Amino acid sequence: VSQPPSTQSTEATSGVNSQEVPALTAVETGASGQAIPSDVVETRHVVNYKTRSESCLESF
């Protein structure tokens, strides 16, 4: 018995006022944008069970 890998869950976060700016970047590098909810707004804790089980090339 095993557990299929789920898509990133949302860990609860809050305010901020640091010199750490996840919002800004420089896509010139060729790297896509990385930010996620947590980086920008205050989030709640969410346990994600859903899986990209159907986007697997074999399923696609």
Residues lying near ligand 5GP in the complex (CB under 6 A): 15-18
Q: Residue 36 or 42: which CB sits closer to ligand 5GP? A: 42
Radius of gyration of the chain (CA): 16
Could you tell me the smallest distance in angstroms from the CB atom of residue 8 to Ca ion? 6
- Short-list 3, 5, 2, 1, CA closest to 52: 5
Residue span binding Ca ion (CB under 5 A) among the ranges 16-24, 26-34, 38-46, 48-56: 48-56
One symbol per residue from 1 to 40: x for binding another protein (CB under 8 A), - otherwise; what is it?
xxxxxxxxxx-xxx-----xxxxxxxxxxxxxxxxxx-xx
Cross-strand bridge partners of residue 46: 10
What are the φ/ψ torsions at residue 29 (nearest 5 degrees)?
Answer: -50, -30
